[PDB]
């Protein structure tokens, strides 16, 4: 359906222990394709998807160039945020920045975004219209002004509506076998006897792509959300995902319960039943 490109930047100070940690990751949909890590050897932007490896020197030299410009801008930011907030040079603090663009099934621009965060909390963010900002508090107000006076949002809106999406569209072809795929969940159920008056019923979705999925239990057709244990959707490690939902059933009523799976890759919603 739709598709997205997103870059994630984690910048963490290490006072009396040197330069800041700076990590950059890049994703198209749920697939990472690149990484930068201040602490690694190459100081290059490295590929983490096999489709991107044959991009060329021009691409790699540029991404490295830019990823290092980010690194530096983030090295300054950490100090500037120490000041805004009147904080000690002793403290280790964290900055986070996420930006990316989305195309619809038309592979036509749909939306862009840019969020910045100091210490796990919203700082400033590009609003949906990509022409104005939302400073979260008093400190971010200074940035909001600074950035409006720099016409920062003009420059972002342009990247997001151009470079961003055109390259998102590029990658979707360069890795069409990976990215335009739809690995439907491999599903099955299990039954353990938590006691002799009870038994755990667990619904498994394995090896699916993308991550978006929905697992739900029912008793007599009626949802058990209140009484269901959902784990977070988790990485299998091979570019697919996993997830399970478990209910406890008083022995005898296994018949009453059903599990339900909704995914992109299923033509019809699966209705599992312990029957």
């Amino acid at each position: 359906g739709s598709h997205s490109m997103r870059y994630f930047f984690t910048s963490v100070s290490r006072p009396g222990r040197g330069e800041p940690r700076f990590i950059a990751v890049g994703y198209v949909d749920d697939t990472q394709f690149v990484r930068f890590d201040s602490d690694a050897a190459s100081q290059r932007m490295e590929p983490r998807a096999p489709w991107i490896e044959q991009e060329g020197p021009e691409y790699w030299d540029g991404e490295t160039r830019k990823v290092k410009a980010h690194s530096q801008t983030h090295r300054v930011d950490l100090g500037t945020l120490r000041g805004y907030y009147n904080q000690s040079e002793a403290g280790s603090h964290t900055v986070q920045r996420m930006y990316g663009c989305d195309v619809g099934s038309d592979w036509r621009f749909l939306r862009g975004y840019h969020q910045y965060a100091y210490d796990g909390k919203d700082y400033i963010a590009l609003k949906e219209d990509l022409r104005s900002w939302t400073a979260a508090d008093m400190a971010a107000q200074t940035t909001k002004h600074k950035w409006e006076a720099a016409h920062v949002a003009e420059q972002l809106r342009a990247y997001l509506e151009g470079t961003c999406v055109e390259w998102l569209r590029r990658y979707l072809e360069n890795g069409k076998e990976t990215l335009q795929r739809t690995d439907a969940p491999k599903t099955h159920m299990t039954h353990h006897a938590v006691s002799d008056h009870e038994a755990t019923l667990r619904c498994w979705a394995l090896s699916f792509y993308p991550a978006e999925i929905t697992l739900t239990w029912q008793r007599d057709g009626e949802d058990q959300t209140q009484d269901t244990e959902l784990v977070e959707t988790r990485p299998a490690g091979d570019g697919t995902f996993q997830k399970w939902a478990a209910v406890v059933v008083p022995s005898g009523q296994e018949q009453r319960y059903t599990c339900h799976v909704q995914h992109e890759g299923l033509p019809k919603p699966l209705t599992l039943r312990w029957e």
Binding site: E63, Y84, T143, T163
Partner: peptide, 8 residues
């Protein structure tokens, strides 16, 4: 493809 990059 990366994006300046303005500081806070």
């Amino acid at each position: 493809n990366l994006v300046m990059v303005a500081t806070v």
